[PDB]
Amino acid sequence: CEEPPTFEAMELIGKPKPYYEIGERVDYKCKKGYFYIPPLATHTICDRNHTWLPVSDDACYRETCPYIRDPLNGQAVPANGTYEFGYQMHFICNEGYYLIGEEILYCELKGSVAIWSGKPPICEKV
Ligand SMILES: *[C@@H]1O[C@H](CO)[C@@H](O[C@@H]2O[C@H](CO)[C@@H](O)[C@H](O[C@@H]3O[C@H](CO[C@H]4O[C@H](CO)[C@@H](O)[C@H](O[C@H]5O[C@H](CO)[C@@H](O)[C@H](O)[C@@H]5O[C@H]5O[C@H](CO)[C@@H](O)[C@H](O)[C@@H]5O)[C@@H]4O)[C@@H](O)[C@H](O[C@H]4O[C@H](CO)[C@@H](O)[C@H](O)[C@@H]4O[C@H]4O[C@H](CO)[C@@H](O)[C@H](O)[C@@H]4O)[C@@H]3O)[C@H]2NC(C)=O)[C@H](O)[C@H]1NC(C)=O
Ligand SMILES: *[C@@H]1O[C@H](CO)[C@@H](O[C@@H]2O[C@H](CO)[C@@H](O)[C@H](O[C@@H]3O[C@H](CO)[C@@H](O)[C@H](O[C@H]4O[C@H](CO)[C@@H](O)[C@H](O)[C@@H]4O)[C@@H]3O)[C@H]2NC(C)=O)[C@H](O)[C@H]1NC(C)=O
Ligand SMILES: [Ca+2]
Ligand SMILES: [Cl-]
């Protein structure tokens, strides 16, 4: 096999070789800001078809901004589904009930932690 994949959350351990013999195993690590969360794989092997076995960065977790209790009568559903930084929180209200706050709270880099965008919505009545 050639050089193992590159990921946005994982960094290969040891320096890249040009060629890897079949049955050779490479191991990765979470990049400076990440945290690994069991169980998922973070390594790979060079199979008999001289390709690497599938593997994902999707286990190395980037910090997270706190938790948001579903505003009574609307669920606090994430799109870009995750409470990690760099994404958003939206307050879709119930077919009818509209908002006293704002539809989307974006979670992102603040200092070292990551906090969402401002303060969350109230789901009132009509
Ligand atoms: C062991 O090692 C090998 C070594 O790499 C691995 O290789 C794979 O094997 C083949 C053979 O080399 C490669 O084709 C593949 O890389 C490309 O594959 C493309 C995917 O094919 C799709 O397009 C088809 C064309 O319409 C489409 O029908 C098809 O959908 C079906 O096929 C997929 C995969 O075959 C299948 O999973 C799916 O279920 C579908 O089912 C098909 O099969 C049925 C039975 O036959 C049939 O009934 C269905 O109708 C259906 O066909 C795929 O989605 C190839 O399309 C691509 O070929 C190029 O050439 C043509 C002709 O000139 C161009 O039109 C076309 O645009 C392609 O060129 C572009 O793409 C290349 C590559 O990105 C790019 O460089 C060019 O610039 C250009 O844009 C390639 O051959 C390899 N996959 C991988 C992951 O490497 C094996 O995986 C491995 N085995 C194992 C177990 O791991
Ligand atoms: C996080 O999830 C969000 C969903 O809740 C998402 O935010 C939205 O992104 C969607 C696109 O990914 C969009 O629905 C929305 O904006 C647009 O929707 C149009 C469809 O009606 C698209 O057409 C449009 O762009 C594309 O289409 C035109 C052709 O019609 C092309 O010309 C153009 O080049 C382009 O290809 C666009 O997608 C947007 N809404 C909000 C609040 O952002 C968000 O993207 C997800 N974030 C991540 C990081 O994935
Ligand atoms: Ca990812
Ligand atoms: Cl592992």
Side-chain angles (χ1 to χ4, degrees):
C1 303
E2 301 208 33
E3 284 87 24
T6 32
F7 298 96
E8 184 197 323
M10 272 152 76
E11 278 177 63
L12 171 82
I13 301 175
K15 316 191 175 196
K17 293 182 215 195
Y19 169 77
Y20 284 101
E21 293 177 329
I22 287 186
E24 269 216 82
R25 179 210 170 126
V26 300
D27 285 58
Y28 290 79
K29 69 183 196 66
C30 287
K31 286 176 179 187
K32 169 76 185 202
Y34 311 82
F35 297 125
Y36 162 68
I37 282 318
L40 282 182
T42 83
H43 56 267
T44 275
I45 308 217
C46 184
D47 91 325
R48 36 246 228 157
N49 194 24
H50 266 297
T51 65
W52 292 98
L53 294 169
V55 63
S56 316
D57 68 299
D58 306 321
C60 274
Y61 286 19
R62 61 215 239 132
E63 285 222 25
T64 42
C65 306
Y67 181 47
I68 300 153
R69 2 298 185 118
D70 328 296
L72 317 182
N73 301 331
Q75 258 290 326
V77 183
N80 303 161
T82 146
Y83 290 47
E84 296 169 292
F85 75 69
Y87 293 111
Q88 62 206 4
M89 194 63 271
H90 40 262
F91 306 79
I92 278 187
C93 260
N94 262 150
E95 160 78 357
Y97 275 72
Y98 251 77
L99 311 196
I100 308 183
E102 314 106 7
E103 180 184 310
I104 312 165
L105 274 186
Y106 316 82
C107 154
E108 223 243 322
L109 246 266
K110 309 252 78 184
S112 318
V113 70
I115 334 176
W116 300 87
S117 75
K119 97 291 156 294
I122 299 121
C123 188
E124 243 236 348
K125 185 196 285 213
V126 69

